[PDB]
Design a protein around this ligand. Structure first.
Ligand SMILES: *[C@@H]1O[C@H](CO)[C@@H](O[C@@H]2O[C@H](CO)[C@@H](O)[C@H](O)[C@H]2NC(C)=O)[C@H](O)[C@H]1NC(C)=O
Ligand SMILES: *[C@@H]1O[C@H](CO)[C@@H](O[C@@H]2O[C@H](CO)[C@@H](O)[C@H](O)[C@H]2NC(C)=O)[C@H](O)[C@H]1NC(C)=O
Ligand SMILES: *[C@@H]1O[C@H](CO)[C@@H](O)[C@H](O)[C@H]1NC(C)=O
Ligand SMILES: *[C@@H]1O[C@H](CO)[C@@H](O)[C@H](O)[C@H]1NC(C)=O
Ligand SMILES: *[C@@H]1O[C@H](CO)[C@@H](O)[C@H](O)[C@H]1NC(C)=O
Ligand SMILES: *[C@@H]1O[C@H](CO)[C@@H](O)[C@H](O)[C@H]1NC(C)=O
Ligand SMILES: *[C@@H]1O[C@H](CO)[C@@H](O)[C@H](O)[C@H]1NC(C)=O
Ligand SMILES: *[C@@H]1O[C@H](CO)[C@@H](O)[C@H](O)[C@H]1NC(C)=O
Ligand SMILES: *[C@@H]1O[C@H](CO)[C@@H](O)[C@H](O)[C@H]1NC(C)=O
Lengths: 254, 99, 361, 120, 49, 50
């Protein structure tokens, strides 16, 4: 089942500053009271991060490129954002990745889904609406896990695909800022490593409608793109990354 | 920065040791920098070549480290000879030498 | 010392002659705890099996597959593995496991093999020539045979062409052996493809029902995740052992650690990128990896003109790891420590000197 | 610990002996340097218990009895202000003995002037 | 300007950093030598007319 | 072939740096002597013979 959403309001997507966000732990190695230089796919400091809104009538589900990796930030309250779609053609011709977080558990499936133009979930005012794909024929990987998830919650995720390995990094942050990304530093812990082994060039954000037509709950998300670069990370006495330096940002940090 | 001269020597020696230890992580053109990985992954005819590349790289690193250690030893020996001269002429007597 | 100095006369002094290495004693191979067993109970211990034509295929992924339980069972008559040996199955790792289950006759078990021929291979279940996996068969006359005759198991007797490998044909279309069209009626020259095996308990061993499970192991370019369980040698602490923790190997002394790791972190590195801390996979505890003791071995002797007595200094080595005296320079063996202070004759280090009067330090 | 690596390393000859000999020469040279700088007196001179030097105060350079290290306040400040087959050999003269040598030199130059450097 | 050569050169480690550091030390040492020899007075004296 | 060129050029550069450091030590010794002569011969009268 697929449903076209024809009540959207036309507005250009916004842009804002990344500040010092998007830093994740590059590996599973403990380091204490040290300064470590690492070359990896990172989000540049103070970069231009694309801003999308969900407000009522804005419902931002465009088609975005994946490139080398995607940083996904979410200023979220009341649990609208539910999952992601990864793939190349997003149809039954190629093989695509599904990540969903419904009311019970987190499901990851690698199948050839015939995706809808507007994939979505729904909450009735209980969850009783799911319209993401019309078919699933060849499934290779399934993984059921625990639930990952004024704006009160900040969700940071990093999705990378290197050597057939899908690295998902996550961080949950209590915030009380109304509109934009708070300025500060928070290192993203690694959440899961998935052996999907598929080509990914395009991705989709999955949202949830609120029904009482449809109404979009207040949410905002940010999409940034990873580039191969070097960071200098500072590890404290407790092994937590507390500060970072972008090696190619300005001559002082260089 | 009053005691920079001693701290410079301490920093140089520690930095030389850190560089010498760090040079083990380099493969020097071999498939890996770990000897066990080469010995467990390859047959001895090609593992001999890979181990030879690691040996020549590490030996070059060690010879380089010894060379700057000898040069720094000469510099420290000159400084120590000067210090012994100052101890003999300034502390154990009164020196007429200007400055 | 004479060998090192290339002389038969040794002048009084201290000569660094050799090196000491605390040799490794045991091997500790700790990998993760055995959890998430693969659902082998729902394949082998199933209450009913499928026919050879509509053979059941179960795809087994993302779990731990213990193959030694199957190999060491006495309940299986055939455990013939093609393309791999059963001893290394419990070590190797595969991307997916295909468990095909069906029932055939006793005389038809030989046809479940690469390169064979017969009704089962040509029309019912075909194995490829390049097949990697195991064929497990056992007698099931107790379950699948009744006194009246069990007609629930069928086989495809005809088809125009032979099956491709790992093909399933569940079509019930009337076989055309002649030029005349069947038109859906089983008349002259037109027969029904699926025929039952009337399994009765009083049958011969070549006609008794045999449940066959074929496990197909393939390696694809994705990372292989269905790995056989590894074992865990009993952890030994405070000794120089060869440790292998989750594929990270080395040699060291594993002692208790006060470093509090974060839950996602497993290994620990210092400034010089050497592994000095590690997390045990079985029990979530932090262990410090101290490198095994290595030290210079120096010989302290007077002139050979005076005496042949010598003392041995192990530099930077504690005396419990080798007239034994502990110095800051290392462990000195063969010299009697005295409380008197004299001029330095043979320098040892850290304010310690040796002299001959026996050898005193 | 690789036996094959050592067997291949033996083909290159006595490079390792040369490097060890050079490092040993440097290590003994450091002790020789410390002997040359600090051990210029064979008598350990001591200051009198009464510090009556005609108004001259040497408390900042004489050893402090309160400190276990027997260092001067200046020397204590100086020590506070300085912060895979590799081994570090300890120096032949420890810090307290070097401090004792400096104390002997200070006592000689305070109580005897330059006379102790040229004889009795 | 060869990228492949630089990629192969990265396998040898921090030799280039060592050489640059040594040359930098020599370069600052020359200036220190000139300061030690010539800059021994902090007053610029002039002769009478 | 590039590896052979790299090892040859790296050996040449290391050799050049080695003699540069040795010459730097010699020039530093000469400069220390020159500073001593500037302090003792120009800024004072020296009793040291020759
Ligand atoms: C929702 O809208 C999309 C976009 O118009 C529809 O996708 C189109 O489907 C028609 C089918 O006749 C194709 O010819 C177009 O090329 C499609 N366009 C795109 C951009 O994919 C989709 O079918 C609509 N959903 C439903 C249920 O009608
Ligand atoms: C010599 O100098 C020392 C240090 O300047 C004097 O010690 C001080 O004595 C006063 C008075 O007793 C104290 O308040 C200070 O705290 C002391 N300073 C230190 C560092 O201990 C000392 O009195 C002077 N005179 C003699 C004769 O020793
Ligand atoms: C971000 O990009 C938009 C256009 O893509 C541009 O108008 C805006 O100025 C950019 N922001 C910054 C801070 O460069
Ligand atoms: C969540 O998804 C899983 C997998 O599709 C499903 O089994 C479960 O019932 C779903 N829960 C809800 C509340 O929809
Ligand atoms: C994928 O599905 C299609 C249709 O279901 C099928 O024809 C094709 O063989 C399948 N491919 C694989 C690799 O399973
Ligand atoms: C992945 O897909 C993109 C576009 O579909 C293509 O350009 C690229 O070559 C593909 N890569 C692989 C490894 O298949
Ligand atoms: C590290 O943890 C300790 C408690 O174990 C805490 O007292 C200390 O403040 C922490 N340090 C930082 C920088 O958070
Ligand atoms: C299946 O049944 C047999 C006989 O009761 C039993 O020994 C075995 O443990 C069961 N499970 C498997 C996986 O074979
Ligand atoms: C591993 O299993 C042992 C029992 O064999 C148990 O005591 C221990 O708690 C387990 N550890 C983890 C991390 O599950």
């Amino acid at each position: 089942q697929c449903v076209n959403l024809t009540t959207r309001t036309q507005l250009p997507p916004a842009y804002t500053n990344s500040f010092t966000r998007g830093v994740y732990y590059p590996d599973k190695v403990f380091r204490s009271s040290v300064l470590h230089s690492t070359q990896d796919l990172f989000l540049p400091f103070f970069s231009n991060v694309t801003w999308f809104h969900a407000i009522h009538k804005r419902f931002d589900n465009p088609v975005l490129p994946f490139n080398d990796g995607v940083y996904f930030a979410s200023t979220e309250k009341s649990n609208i954002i539910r999952g992601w779609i990864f793939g190349t053609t997003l149809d039954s011709k190629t093989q695509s990745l599904l990540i969903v977080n419904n009311a019970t558990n987190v499901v990851i499936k690698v199948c050839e889904f015939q995706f809808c133009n507007d994939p979505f979930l729904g909450v009735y005012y209980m969850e009783s609406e799911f319209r993401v794909y019309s078919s699933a024929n060849n499934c290779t990987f399934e993984y059921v896990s625990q639930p990952f998830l004024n704006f009160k919650n900040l969700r940071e995720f990093v999705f990378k695909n290197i050597d057939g390995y899908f690295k998902i990094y996550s961080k949950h942050t209590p915030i009380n800022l109304v509109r934009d990304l708070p300025q500060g530093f928070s290192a993203l812990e690694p959440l899961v490593d998935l052996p999907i082994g598929i080509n990914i060039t395009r991705f989709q954000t999955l949202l949830a409608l609120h029904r009482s037509g449809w109404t979009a709950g207040a949410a905002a998300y940010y999409v940034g793109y990873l580039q191969p670069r070097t960071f200098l990370l500072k590890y404290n006495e407790n092994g937590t990354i507390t500060d970072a330096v972008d090696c190619a940002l300005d001559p002082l940090s260089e | 920065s009053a005691l920079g001269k001693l701290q410079d020597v301490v920093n140089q020696n520690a930095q030389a040791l850190n560089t010498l230890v760090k040079q083990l992580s380099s493969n020097f053109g071999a498939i890996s920098s770990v000897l066990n990985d080469i010995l467990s992954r390859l047959d001895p005819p090609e593992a001999e070549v890979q181990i030879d590349r690691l040996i020549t790289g590490r030996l070059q690193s060690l010879q380089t480290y010894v060379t700057q250690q000898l040069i720094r030893a000469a510099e420290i020996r000159a400084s120590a000879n000067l210090a012994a001269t100052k101890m003999s002429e300034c502390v154990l007597g009164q020196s007429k030498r200007v400055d | 010392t004479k060998c090192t100095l290339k002389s038969f006369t040794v002048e009084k002094g201290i000569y660094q002659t050799s090196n000491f290495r605390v040799q490794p004693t045991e091997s500790i191979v700790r990998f993760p705890n055995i959890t998430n067993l693969c659902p082998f109970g729902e394949v082998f211990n199933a209450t009913r099996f499928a026919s050879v034509y509509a053979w059941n295929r179960k795809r087994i992924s993302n779990c731990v597959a213990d193959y030694s339980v199957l190999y060491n069972s006495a309940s299986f008559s055939t455990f013939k593995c093609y393309g791999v040996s059963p001893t290394k199955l419990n070590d190797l790792c595969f991307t997916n496991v295909y468990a095909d289950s069906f029932v055939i006759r006793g005389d038809e078990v030989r046809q479940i093999a690469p390169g064979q021929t017969g009704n089962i291979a040509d029309y019912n279940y075909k194995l490829p020539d390049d097949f990697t996996g195991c064929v497990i068969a056992w007698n099931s006359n107790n379950l699948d045979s009744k006194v009246g005759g069990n007609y629930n198991y069928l086989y495809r007797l005809f088809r125009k062409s032979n099956l491709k490998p790992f093909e399933r044909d569940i079509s019930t279309e009337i076989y055309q052996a002649g030029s005349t069209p069947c038109n859906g009626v089983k008349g002259f020259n037109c027969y029904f493809p699926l025929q039952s095996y009337g399994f009765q308990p009083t049958y011969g061993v070549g006609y008794q029902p045999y449940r066959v499970v074929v496990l197909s192991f393939e390696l694809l370019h994705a990372p292989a995740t269905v790995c056989g369980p590894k074992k865990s040698t009993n952890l030994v602490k405070n000794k120089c052992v060869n440790f292998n923790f989750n594929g990270l190997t080395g040699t060291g002394v594993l002692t208790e650690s006060n470093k509090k790791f974060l839950p996602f972190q497993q290994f620990g590195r210092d400034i010089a990128d050497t592994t000095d801390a590690v997390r045990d996979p079985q029990t979530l505890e932090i262990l410090d990896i101290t490198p095994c003791s290595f030290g210079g071995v120096s010989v302290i002797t007077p002139g050979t003109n005076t005496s042949n007595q010598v003392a041995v200094l192990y530099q930077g080595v504690n005396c419990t790891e080798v007239n034994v005296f502990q110095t800051r320079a290392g462990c000195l063996i063969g010299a009697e420590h005295v409380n008197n202070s004299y001029e330095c004759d043979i320098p040892i280090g850290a304010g310690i000197c040796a002299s001959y009067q026996s050898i005193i330090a | 610990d690789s036996t094959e690596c050592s067997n291949l390393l033996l083909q290159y000859g006595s490079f390792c002996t040369q490097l060890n000999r050079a490092l040993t020469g440097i290590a003994v040279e450091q002790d020789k340097n410390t002997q040359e700088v600090f051990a210029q007196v064979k008598q350990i001179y001591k200051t009198p218990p009464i510090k009556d030097f005609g108004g001259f105060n040497f408390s900042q350079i004489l050893p402090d009895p309160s400190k276990p290290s027997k260092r001067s306040p200046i020397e204590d400040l100086l020590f506070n202000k300085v912060t895979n087959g590799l081994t570090v050999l300890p120096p032949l003269l420890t810090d307290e003995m070097i401090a004792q040598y400096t104390s002997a030199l200070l006592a000689g130059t305070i109580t005897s002037g330059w006379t102790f450097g040229a004889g009795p």
